Amino acid sequence: SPHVFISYSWSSEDHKEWVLDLANKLMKESGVEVILDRWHGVVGHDRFEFMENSIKIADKVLVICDKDYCEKANTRRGGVGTETMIITPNIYNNTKQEKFIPISLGEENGEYFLPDFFKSRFALGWNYEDIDKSYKELERLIWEEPLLKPPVRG
Numbered sequence: 753s754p755h756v757f758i759s760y761s762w763s764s765e766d767h768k769e770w771v772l773d774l775a776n777k778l779m780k781e782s783g784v785e786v787i788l789d790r791w792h793g794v795v796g797h798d799r800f801e802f803m804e805n806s807i808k809i810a811d812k813v814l815v816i817c818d819k820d821y822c823e824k825a826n827t828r829r830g831g832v833g834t835e836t837m838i839i840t841p842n843i844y845n846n847t848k849q850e851k852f853i854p855i856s857l858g859e860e861n862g863e864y865f866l867p868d869f870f871k872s873r874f875a876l877g878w879n880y881e882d883i884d885k886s887y888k889e890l891e892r893l894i895w896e897e898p899l900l901k902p903p904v905r906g
Contacts, residue, residue, distance in 0.1 A: 757806040760816035799837040825867035
């Protein structure tokens with residue numbers, strides 16, 4: 753089954769719970785395996801290593817783009833360290849684009865919360881007023897295999 757890593761920031765307790773609820777839902781309803789830091793008991797200073805490794809082994813990587821994740825992804829106040837849990841330009845660049853499914857939680861200035869360095873400007877814009885529709889589309893994107901195109905009819 754698809755193995756799905758969830759990259760997110762611990763912005764607040766409510767946000768952690770939303771991500772946890774999503775992880776559970778995906779495994780319960782969508783038949784995928786989810787790689788989640790809390791289920792692995794990841795130590796703070798192993799977060800970068802967990803992130804790097806999990807992206808490598810995942811089929812799909814959900815990037816939970818709330819304002820916090822985006823602003824930290826854009827700024828990098830520390831200069832990237834062992835505790836870093838937010839995707840970096842270097843990690844993004846070295847990963848096939850097709851792995852990432854950015855989910856924008858809200859928007860600003862008429863645009864999705866997406867880190868500056870994400871090359872495609874696409875994201876699943878989460879619709880809090882139609883969760884079923886948003887979740888259905890997330891599920892579709894997870895099971896899609898864009899690396900695979902049917903060949904030419906001869």
